[PDB]
Design a protein around this ligand. Structure first.
Ligand SMILES: *[C@@H]1O[C@H](CO)[C@@H](O[C@@H]2O[C@H](CO)[C@@H](O)[C@H](O)[C@H]2NC(C)=O)[C@H](O)[C@H]1NC(C)=O
Ligand SMILES: *[C@@H]1O[C@H](CO)[C@@H](O[C@@H]2O[C@H](CO)[C@@H](O)[C@H](O)[C@H]2NC(C)=O)[C@H](O)[C@H]1NC(C)=O
Ligand SMILES: *[C@@H]1O[C@H](CO)[C@@H](O[C@@H]2O[C@H](CO)[C@@H](O)[C@H](O)[C@H]2NC(C)=O)[C@H](O)[C@H]1NC(C)=O
Ligand SMILES: *[C@@H]1O[C@H](CO)[C@@H](O[C@@H]2O[C@H](CO)[C@@H](O)[C@H](O)[C@H]2NC(C)=O)[C@H](O)[C@H]1NC(C)=O
Ligand SMILES: *[C@@H]1O[C@H](CO)[C@@H](O[C@@H]2O[C@H](CO)[C@@H](O)[C@H](O)[C@H]2NC(C)=O)[C@H](O)[C@H]1NC(C)=O
Ligand SMILES: *[C@@H]1O[C@H](CO)[C@@H](O[C@@H]2O[C@H](CO)[C@@H](O)[C@H](O)[C@H]2NC(C)=O)[C@H](O)[C@H]1NC(C)=O
Ligand SMILES: *[C@@H]1O[C@H](CO)[C@@H](O[C@@H]2O[C@H](CO)[C@@H](O)[C@H](O)[C@H]2NC(C)=O)[C@H](O)[C@H]1NC(C)=O
Ligand SMILES: *[C@@H]1O[C@H](CO)[C@@H](O)[C@H](O)[C@H]1NC(C)=O
Ligand SMILES: *[C@@H]1O[C@H](CO)[C@@H](O)[C@H](O)[C@H]1NC(C)=O
Ligand SMILES: *[C@@H]1O[C@H](CO)[C@@H](O)[C@H](O)[C@H]1NC(C)=O
Lengths: 407, 64, 94, 98, 49
């Protein structure tokens, strides 16, 4: 009931997070899948209403929604910001994440590593945005957040030195600026080493992005393999049924194939709809994460990484987005003795923004997230009431700065 | 025409397929009608043009 | 039944209870510090003072009304179990 | 335009919120359910393709997702912390929840 | 087969809804238990403690 623990050091750690944003856009045609360009099959299928119009409409909707997801995830900037030719960011090194002119498609190194890691009635529609353009969006976002902080997320980008920006972030996470300004080299070295560790780990993980591709490929393969099932008929080939029978009883062997293939197609469409809904939810989460961790600083716990979030970097992926969350992790704690308030001259004194700590003989005032003792004065404390109601009060003096200097 | 070579059907060939009736230009505007693979179609003037969509206005932050 | 099988959950109920107990112990002892890394112990009264400081109330209010706050919290906790002795949302899924 | 109201007292309130996290993991044998262990029914069902494979895949995915949901919801701590034997919590009483 | 397909589809939809609820529960745990939330009416009625 009278002991507290306060960290005396910290480590800068960067962690990754992968979120799928979109899936491959596919379209199917009944007249060539179910029928395979045969007039009699189309004539029989005309009796089944307009199921295929519904299927085509659903597939078109889920294809458009993919581009909508990509646009809402990546197109969150108006200008295309560029990093200055000279790169002096107070010792911080972003060479591994900035675009490289020599690399193909002007991708970054980590983007290149991520990209290297991973008919008959069926068509695949290319996405509206190519990989180069998504990479350009990511580069613009990276340059804007490097050279302007969060200002460009609310309007016109305002430049500011990077060290001062990270000082802003430290102030935001409850640590004073002097802690950062007196440890700039150590913080920069830790950040560089942590960035290098991510590169090393990736060069040696992308299961979530692999899963959607595998599921889509499996669904397409199952749909194709379903074409070789007789469904209790003579054969799975339309031409075998055509040129071996006249059409008063061959018409009975045809409709069975029609209903089987229709059932398979409807099942595929339903599964695609459910998968698209899940992908849309993931894309909404990714867009929210981008808007709240990249264009600003989030106070939500464990939303933009593990620890106290400082700032994040986005990176493009084949069909997703990869975030590099930079978090502040305290370490090397020593525990002391603590009192809720100090009684002096019959009055109780409370700390303005810190806590009272004692190393055994003396009492100090320090910030809660970093050990930095200070002499207790009347400038960092305020007075409220008398020292007989609060439980745990200890006796100590409060140094008034005015009295000695005046006399 | 989707995923069809232009020889199998003024005339412009893109990644999305073969496009007939649009004039390819060297400019870069905002996307009006999305064609696919970074190509968009718009009606300037009286006529239809096909171009590459422009991501946005270029801006370099005076950083020091 | 005829081909129907009910798989057992991977995490047995006492294991989930142990997770909940660990979470409660961490919250009571270290406040929110254990959620960002190593758990840092702190008296509960000062953690509650922090929490009042987070909602725009000066921390002296807690140090002057600790007994009243504790009594109100205990009364509310006691009222919770009486209110329990509802869960329709869980029953609907089953 | 010149009147304000300031509270002079406060109350501590606790409210319960209940959220489902998992379902019952069920797996159904397609062949035995459809046919009931008869060879002829299995032979006719073999003509229908691989529907049972897809059904089993979907059910297995749901079953795995249930455990993943439980792990995400609850396994958010690295070490199993234990409360001290004493209960000096400044007058707060957690006996009903410990 | 039709009955089994209907059952599987309904189970898939229910599982998606339950997964959404579980994600909400995980977020609520991370933001109300592991820290103090300033979001209004997210961790109860009033000012969350
Ligand atoms: C805080 O931690 C950092 C690193 O965790 C310490 O810096 C290390 O100091 C040792 C001692 O000379 C060196 O061998 C290492 O190379 C340093 N690491 C880096 C990355 O420079 C630092 O000394 C610690 N500060 C305190 C006050 O303990
Ligand atoms: C930022 O880090 C990169 C490496 O991640 C540095 O680039 C390499 O630096 C070494 C050291 O001189 C050279 O030998 C390599 O040729 C560089 N290029 C590579 C490895 O592709 C870069 O110099 C660092 N930035 C600064 C300002 O030092
Ligand atoms: C905080 O103070 C406690 C109280 O002594 C320390 O906890 C003990 O540490 C010793 C050394 O490893 C153990 O043998 C005891 O089992 C611990 N618990 C007790 C005595 O109840 C703790 O080490 C201190 N924290 C730090 C970071 O030094
Ligand atoms: C607790 O901190 C105080 C800080 O004032 C220490 O007191 C000083 O310690 C230094 C180091 O030996 C001496 O040179 C000074 O003369 C001491 N007094 C003052 C007024 O500065 C004290 O030693 C510390 N105690 C422990 C156990 O660490
Ligand atoms: C803190 O200091 C005050 C006054 O300096 C102490 O109050 C005195 O306590 C003694 C012994 O209990 C009494 O004989 C005096 O009459 C008290 N004086 C006043 C003005 O109250 C108080 O006990 C000290 N607290 C601690 C923990 O040492
Ligand atoms: C603020 O509210 C508290 C409780 O709602 C009041 O304390 C009550 O005071 C009455 C009057 O003597 C007692 O009968 C009750 O038993 C008290 N409640 C408890 C829980 O002890 C308090 O008077 C109100 N006003 C102030 C200024 O605190
Ligand atoms: C914490 O609350 C529990 C009840 O929720 C208290 O246990 C009861 O204590 C009263 C006397 O104060 C007994 O009459 C009851 O029989 C107890 N109920 C039990 C043991 O189930 C417990 O005493 C409280 N803790 C403290 C430190 O006051
Ligand atoms: C702390 O607990 C000890 C018992 O070990 C007790 O003597 C002391 O009065 C308590 N102090 C406070 C402020 O609760
Ligand atoms: C289209 O046809 C032309 C003419 O043979 C050929 O050169 C070209 O490779 C084909 N494919 C594309 C994409 O132009
Ligand atoms: C567009 O520019 C290219 C130069 O890269 C030129 O070869 C081509 O003729 C131009 N086309 C038009 C329509 O201006």
């Amino acid at each position: 009931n009278n002991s507290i623990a306060i960290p005396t050091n910290f480590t800068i750690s960067v962690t990754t997070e992968i979120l799928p944003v979109s899936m491959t856009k596919t379209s199917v045609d009944c007249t060539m899948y179910i029928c395979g360009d045969s007039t009699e099959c189309s004539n029989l299928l005309l009796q089944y209403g307009s199921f295929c119009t519904q299927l085509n409409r659903a597939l078109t909707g889920i294809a458009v929604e993919q581009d909508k997801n990509t646009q809402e995830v990546f197109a969150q900037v108006k200008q295309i910001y560029k990093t200055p030719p000279i790169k002096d960011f107070g010792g911080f090194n972003f060479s591994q994440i900035l675009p490289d002119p020599s690399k193909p498609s002007k991708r970054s190194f980590i983007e290149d590593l991520l990209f290297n890691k991973v008919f008959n009635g069926l068509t695949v529609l290319p996405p509206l945005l190519t990989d180069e353009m998504i990479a350009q969006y990511t580069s613009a976002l990276l340059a804007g957040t490097i050279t302007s902080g969060w200002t460009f997320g609310a309007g016109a980008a305002l430049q500011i030195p990077f060290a001062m920006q990270m000082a802003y972030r430290f102030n935001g996470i409850g640590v004073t600026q002097n802690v950062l300004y007196e440890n700039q080299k150590l913080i920069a070295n830790q950040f560089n080493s942590a960035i290098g560790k991510i590169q090393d780990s990736l060069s040696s993980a992308l299961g979530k992005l692999q899963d959607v591709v595998n599921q889509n490929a499996q669904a397409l393969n199952t749909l194709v393999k379903q074409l070789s099932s007789n469904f209790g008929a003579i054969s799975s080939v339309l031409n075998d049924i055509l040129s071996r029978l006249d059409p008063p009883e061959a018409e009975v062997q045809i409709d069975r194939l029609i209903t089987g293939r229709l059932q398979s197609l409807q099942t595929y469409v339903t599964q695609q709809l459910i998968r698209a809904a899940e992908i849309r939810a993931s894309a909404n989460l990714a867009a929210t994460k981008m808007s709240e961790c990249v264009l600003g600083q989030s106070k939500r716990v464990d939303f933009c990484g593990k620890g106290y979030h400082l700032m994040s970097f986005p990176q493009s992926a084949p069909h997703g987005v990869v975030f590099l969350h930079v978090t502040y992790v305290p370490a090397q704690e020593k525990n002391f003795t603590t009192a809720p308030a100090i009684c002096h001259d019959g009055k109780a004194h409370f700390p303005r923004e810190g806590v009272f700590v004692s190393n055994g003989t003396h009492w100090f005032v320090t910030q809660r997230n970093f050990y930095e003792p200070q002499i207790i004065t009347t400038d960092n404390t305020f007075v409220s009431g008398n020292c007989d109601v609060v439980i745990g009060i200890v006796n100590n003096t409060v140094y008034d700065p005015l009295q000695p200097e005046l006399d | 025409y989707q995923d069809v070579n232009c020889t199998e059907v003024n005339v412009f060939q893109t990644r999305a397929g073969c496009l007939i009736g649009a004039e390819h230009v060297n400019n870069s505007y905002e996307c009006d009608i999305p064609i696919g693979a970074g190509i968009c179609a718009s009606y300037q003037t009286q006529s239809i043009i096909a171009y590459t969509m422009s991501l946005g206005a270029e801006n370099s932050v005076a950083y020091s």
